[PDB]
């Protein structure tokens, strides 16, 4: 069975709600495992305490920079970067989890949660999961976004891990 991870989201330090994700380990195991281990923190580093640094309403929420906290950082559990595993899965609609990148084979820890279908990203970003519960929380996060993504309040992953 595919693993399920969760983020507990906060807005300026106040709890907003929980978002859980199914990770498609059956189809992108290496990419799913990276996100899983970063969500538990079991390698000594990961998503806990990091912020959603770009929120573009109607497009996506982006996070995952726990090394520089400036939108340029992050690292995978395999090293600084890892290869694009496959492009089997497509950006089919709201709730899709996909890897941010700087070009081919540059996956680290940064990711985005789509809030719309974004087919123009297919073949360029590795899709590896989807929101399971808490899409209403993702929509609440969108209300804090802007044209190019700077946020009006600080949106944090106050805690994260893996559910039974």
């Amino acid at each position: 069975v595919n693993p399920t991870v969760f983020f507990d989201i906060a807005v300026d330090g106040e709890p907003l709600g929980r978002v859980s994700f199914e990770l498609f380990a059956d189809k992108v195991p290496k990419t799913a495992e990276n996100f899983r281990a970063l969500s538990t923190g079991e390698k000594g580093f990961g998503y806990k305490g990091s912020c959603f640094h770009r929120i573009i309403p109607g497009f996506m929420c982006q996070g995952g920079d726990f090394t520089r906290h400036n939108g340029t950082g992050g690292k995978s559990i395999y090293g600084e970067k890892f290869e694009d595993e496959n492009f089997i899965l497509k950006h089919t609609g709201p709730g899709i989890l996909s890897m941010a990148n700087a070009g081919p084979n540059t996956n680290g820890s940064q990711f985005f949660i789509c809030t719309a279908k974004t087919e123009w990203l297919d073949g360029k970003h590795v899709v590896f999961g989807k929101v399971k519960e808490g899409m209403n929380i993702v929509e609440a996060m969108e209300r804090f976004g802007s044209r190019n993504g700077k946020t009006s309040k600080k949106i944090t992953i106050a805690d994260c891990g893996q559910l039974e």
Binding site: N101, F112, T118
Partner: peptide, 11 residues
């Protein structure tokens, strides 16, 4: 790693 946003802005 903002390739997905650059695509969006140009699009």
């Amino acid at each position: 790693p903002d390739c997905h946003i650059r695509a969006y802005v140009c699009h």
